[PDB]
Structure 1
Amino acid sequence: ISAINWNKISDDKDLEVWNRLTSNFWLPEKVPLSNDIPAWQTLTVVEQQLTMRVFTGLTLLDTLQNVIGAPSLMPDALTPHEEAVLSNISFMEAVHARSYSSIFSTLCQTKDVDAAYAWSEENAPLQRKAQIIQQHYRGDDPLKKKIASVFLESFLFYSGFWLPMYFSSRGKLTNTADLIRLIIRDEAVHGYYIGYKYQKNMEKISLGQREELKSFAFDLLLELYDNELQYTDELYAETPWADDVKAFLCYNANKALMNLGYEPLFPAEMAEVNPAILAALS
């Protein structure tokens, strides 16, 4: 163990991402969530239940990435500066997870929040995606860990992120949406950075293993995608939104792939996102 030296950077990307993530620091207390109480009251009981179920699912994934995901990447870091960036990523995942509790406390009845947590424990597609990602994090293959991480950061959140963006486009839960945009601002850099590191590590490996990994990445994404369609159907069943969410999934699946340096899987016909959703995202 040696004292880290930030004036001897071996990969400029490490410093760029360190700077981006740390200068994007936020806490849920900085968002005036309580201003969403009136809009919350205008939602139907079905819409309110959907929101709490969505948010507990996102909490699980952030908790996973904090406790297991980002720490699992640490032994595989190329530089000590990357190790430090990973410590920031792990901490900001805890901030993400915590922020869902801030929303629940501000807007929701505890009996309903507890029901949503229980629903998430029993939800098959949610538990399946958590299981699949965990298996790779706990595995011995550092490159498969990074693929799974990018799929978590750049794809697996987005069936959930869709909803506050939709509400935002309707002028509802705009403060919650501002908070979610802060989470997304982090996740997008996380997926980009880990994807970048995947590609850097791939430079060292054989032509055969590169092909095995590309095939693995596509098969895994297809499996997570199929599972995510089921998760979406079970969440969004009493709404007319399932098709919109699905297109949003395809759109973000293509971004996850590009972060790993791969071509899009889903054609434009499947990844067409309503301009109001895109606008709310910005």
Structure 2
Amino acid sequence: RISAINWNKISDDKDLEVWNRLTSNFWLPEKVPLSNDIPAWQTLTVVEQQLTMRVFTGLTLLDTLQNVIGAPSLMPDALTPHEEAVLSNISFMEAVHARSYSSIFSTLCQTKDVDAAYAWSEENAPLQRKAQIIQQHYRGDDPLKKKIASVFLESFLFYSGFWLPMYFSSRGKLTNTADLIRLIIRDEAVHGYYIGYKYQKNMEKISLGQREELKSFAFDLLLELYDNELQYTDELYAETPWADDVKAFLCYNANKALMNLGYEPLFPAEMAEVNPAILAALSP
């Protein structure tokens, strides 16, 4: 029995709060003047251009996954009808995220190079392993593990890729592309918060023992994904001196992802020190 949704009978105020934040933050890549980044693109080295296309084809795969499988997988596990609606928004915005990378490619890049980057991503072992691990949990029968995977993906792992446009922005390059990426981040910070909140709400009703099992699992999964992401970073950033900074940015964001789920930070300051210029690029 389907019943008419009633937004004047909210069970959890957070659903309305997040519905309003996400919907009022609607954007499309056409709203960003990406074409003004052409001169800056022309100042990048061939290696830097290749890196940018590989970073973005990787993010395209992962946002496609979030649209096709990730957000839909959370729908059967909603606590409220309003959460179901918010999840439909989240799924749609993942499609916008994925679409936006094509907007960047169309504006700035040569088709032959973009296609090479897509092929590179298809054959990249750590990227594919990441996709496989996350999908495995989305396809599984444990609702709580799906939420852990989603938060780790877009509040943590994505930041190996997000680092790059923030770095360019800090150098005065690809500033419009950086604006677009900040719109994606503005969504993902809220997605991680909300999905993490709902994880904790779900946990309120499970047993003490299962809570302990899930925390140990979250740790296991974080460490596995982290080690894999270090390998991905090494392979992506190979022809640059930037891998250490990317890794620090990963650790910094891993702490945020953990906190979204209600867990304490795992990464000490020494491992999570982000260049102030990068942090400034995130919050201009």
- TM bin, normalised by shorter chain, reads over 0.9
Alignment deviations for residues 142-174 of structure 1 (CA, whole Å, 9 cap, x no partner)? 001110011012011100000000000000000
Q: Give the TM-score of the pair, scaled to structure 2.
A: 0.99
The alpha-carbon deviation at position 129 of structure 1 amounts to: 0.4
SS in 2 for 1:269: helix
Aligned to 2:152: 151
The alpha-carbon deviation at position 46 of structure 1 amounts to: 0.2
Alignment deviations for residues 240-275 of structure 1 (CA, whole Å, 9 cap, x no partner)? 100000000000000000000000011110000000
SS in 1 for 2:211: helix
Alignment deviations for residues 52-71 of structure 1 (CA, whole Å, 9 cap, x no partner)? 00000000110000000000
Counting matched residue pairs gives 282
Structure 2 residue 198 is the aligned partner of structure 1 residue 182: no
The alpha-carbon deviation at position 82 of structure 1 amounts to: 0.1
Q: Distance in 2 between matches of 1:271 and 1:265?
A: 10
Alignment deviations for residues 198-229 of structure 1 (CA, whole Å, 9 cap, x no partner)? 00000000000000000000110000000000
Alignment deviations for residues 81-128 of structure 1 (CA, whole Å, 9 cap, x no partner)? 000000000000000000000000000000000000000000000000
- Structure 2 gap segments, 5+ residues each: none
Q: Distance in 2 between matches of 1:156 and 1:2?
A: 38
RMSD of equivalent CA atoms? 0.3
SS in 1 for 2:269: coil
Task: Find runs of 4+ consecutive structure 1 residues off by over 2 angstroms.
Answer: none
Q: Distance in 2 between matches of 1:104 and 1:237?
A: 22
The alpha-carbon deviation at position 31 of structure 1 amounts to: 0.2
Q: Give the TM-score of the pair, scaled to structure 1.
A: 1.00
Q: Distance in 1 between matches of 2:33 and 2:280?
A: 21
Q: Distance in 2 between matches of 1:176 and 1:136?
A: 32
Q: Distance in 1 between matches of 2:165 and 2:145?
A: 31
Aligned to 2:257: 256
Alignment deviations for residues 8-53 of structure 1 (CA, whole Å, 9 cap, x no partner)? 0000000000000000000000000000000000000000000000
